[PDB]
Design a protein around this ligand. Structure first.
Ligand SMILES: Nc1ncnc2c1ncn2[C@@H]1O[C@H](COP(=O)(O)O)[C@@H](O)[C@H]1O
Ligand SMILES: NC(=O)CC[C@H](N)C(=O)O
Length: 529
RNA sequence: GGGGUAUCGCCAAGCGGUAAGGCACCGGAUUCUGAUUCCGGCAUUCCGAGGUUCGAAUCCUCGUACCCCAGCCA
């Protein structure tokens, strides 16, 4: 429950509505991000909880900023999150003929006129936050003139910016949005849906309310920056001949620490190549999270936890990571992998090796087990061996022993260094029958793996509020290591996550993982206290 | 000017009956993943100051802080 579901409840009770119909209206000018996910969960979630409908609509009213590539990926992300829209995918452009007719209705009613104030003059005439604007000198043309001039605009008889269609409201309204908002502007640009049939395009405020009404939307849900816009939303519908009047309700947008949730900024990271692309695992895009290894279910859980309110908020990264850990901690099978390898030989071991049984998931025997190869030459993480270290250190210490995960106990007794004095091989002995702790991988059966450790994209909590957000990128958002994985991962399937015991959750693909050299992305590290 | 919001570090219930839950955090117990699991603690107070009431975070008054609006962007 949230303030919006309560409003719906009350409309159902009072009989104002007998069904709920919502919509997710993204503009196809970029990929969807976790913020869109909050909106997707809200609109599609309400629809299914109330046995209603939710449309997927591409608000494609500005051709120069959109692309068919985006509409393609957006349908992909919505589907991946686990939601289905009502009927066919809709497009604002599907209503261009309708919008054009409604503009004509307004003109016929003296509520719209063709203005020829230049793009600079319109602002000079607009007024300020504390001073009323003033009437354009072209504001009182006759119905006939506006009609003729509007057709000229439509026909291509005006250069760009040389004319626009404006609503006739109030140049002195405290709501800046009501100061004769522009309904149409000229743009000789091919539209990804209508090609070159139009050279004039409808503005957002004129388009959105009419699209909602025609679609039968009951509750139009948007973010807080459109609160002022609601007044123009209602003005348009109140002044044209349309049978329903969808009501808008705004909620606060999502903000995540250490990241940016702006398409213009996300686009800049992609265009200047500071990330691989929109689906870079460090990106807060739905596709980037998917490639990072998050589950749609964990994103839905997250959206469920953060709530829906009217308060400005900035969720912490810990909250998101908790959601993915909960999912993976329960379902991700375990495996051995050494990210920072150093050789360790068991001079005590005899033979070419043997096989040891390891649980696919400790706390869950129902997930079965597997046979893993053990030998006298294995790999362990350098960080797990210490010649000295204090008393806390529960790992392998020169002269002390530790349990090899699901295997034997070993005692380090003779280390060996190189030129710069860097250890190159730890010599230990093992107990014939012995079956802290550390993971390991048999060197002879090791699968060479590239491991990509990811971290926060930016080094500050609120990069979006920096003078130059790019100058605050975290140089270690991605750190590539070459390690060794148990042969078992040879059959790892892209997308599917695994828990590399004592390290974290990882998954394949990474767009780079091939047959010869597999690449794994660290979805998220384990809680290391 | 106008439109909005102010409850534990970060989210968020509470809609006049005298403060849910989640994340984070501090303890203890389990555990061959210092993970998980598991019990235990964590705002005598809800931006501030008055008012009304038997009684308020929940109503009124005046303040204070922050967010949004001057694209022919959405
Ligand atoms: N950060 C955000 N948090 C929540 N909802 C958002 C966010 N950004 C955009 N939306 C929603 O997503 C819809 C489409 O976004 P856009 O691609 O900007 O048109 C908007 O109408 C909002 O309802
Ligand atoms: N009323 C709406 O939610 C439309 C929002 C608009 N598509 C955007 O860019 O967020």
């Amino acid at each position: 429950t949230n303030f919006i579901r309560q409003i719906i409840d009350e409309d159902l009770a009072s009989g104002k509505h007998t069904t709920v119909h919502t919509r997710f209206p993204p503009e196809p000018n970029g990929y969807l991000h976790i913020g869109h996910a909050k909106s997707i969960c809200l609109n599609f979630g309400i629809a299914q909880d109330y046995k209603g409908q939710c449309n997927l609509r591409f608000d494609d009213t500005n051709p120069v900023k959109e692309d068919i590539e985006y509409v393609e990926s957006i349908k992909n992300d919505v589907e991946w999150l686990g939601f289905h829209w009502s009927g066919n995918v809709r497009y604002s452009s599907d209503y261009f003929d309708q919008l054009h007719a409604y503009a004509i209705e307004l003109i016929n009613k003296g509520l719209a006129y063709v203005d020829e104030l230049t793009p600079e003059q319109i602002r000079e005439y607009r007024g300020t936050l504390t001073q009323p604007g003033k009437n354009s000198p072209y504001r009182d043309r006759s119905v006939e003139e506006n009609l003729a001039l509007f057709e000229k605009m439509r026909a291509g008889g005006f250069e760009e910016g040389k004319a626009c269609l404006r609503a006739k409201i109030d140049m002195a309204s405290p709501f800046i949005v009501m100061r004769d908002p522009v309904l149409y502007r000229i743009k000789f640009a091919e539209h990804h849906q209508t090609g070159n049939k139009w050279c004039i395009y409808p503005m957002y405020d004129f388009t959105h309310c009419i699209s909602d009404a025609l679609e039968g939307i009951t509750h139009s849900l948007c973010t807080l920056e459109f609160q002022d816009n609601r007044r123009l939303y209602d003005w348009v519908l109140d002044n044209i001949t349309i049978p329903v009047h969808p009501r808008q309700y705004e909620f606060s947008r999502l903000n995540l620490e250490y990241t940016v949730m702006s398409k213009r900024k996300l686009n800049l990271l992609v265009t200047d190549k500071h990330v691989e692309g929109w689906d870079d695992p460090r990106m807060p895009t739905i596709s980037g999270l998917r490639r990072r290894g998050y589950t749609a279910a964990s994103i839905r859980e997250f959206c469920k936890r953060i709530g829906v309110t009217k308060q400005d908020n900035t969720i912490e990264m810990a909250s998101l990571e908790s959601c993915i850990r909960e999912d993976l901690n329960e379902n991700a099978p375990r495996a051995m992998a050494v990210i920072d390898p150093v050789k360790l030989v068991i001079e005590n071991y005899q033979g070419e090796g043997e096989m040891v049984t390891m649980p696919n998931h400790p706390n869950k025997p129902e997930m079965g087990s597997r046979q893993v190869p053990f030998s006298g030459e294995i790999w362990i993480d350098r960080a797990d061996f210490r010649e000295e270290a204090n008393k806390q250190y529960k790992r392998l210490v020169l002269g002390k022993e530790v349990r090899l995960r699901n295997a034997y106990v070993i005692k380090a007794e003779r280390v060996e260094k190189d030129a710069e004095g860097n250890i190159t091989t730890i010599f230990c002995t093992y107990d014939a029958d012995t079956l802290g702790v550390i993971h390991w991988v048999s060197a002879a059966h090791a699968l060479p793996v590239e491991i990509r450790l990811y971290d926060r994209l930016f080094s500050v909590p609120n990069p979006g509020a920096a003078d130059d957000f790019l100058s605050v990128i975290n140089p270690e958002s991605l750190v590539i290591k070459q390690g060794f994985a148990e042969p078992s991962l040879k059959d790892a399937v892209a997308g599917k996550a695994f828990q590399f015991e004592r390290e974290g959750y990882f998954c394949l693909d990474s767009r780079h993982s091939t047959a010869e050299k597999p690449v794994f992305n660290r979805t998220v590290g384990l809680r290391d206290t």
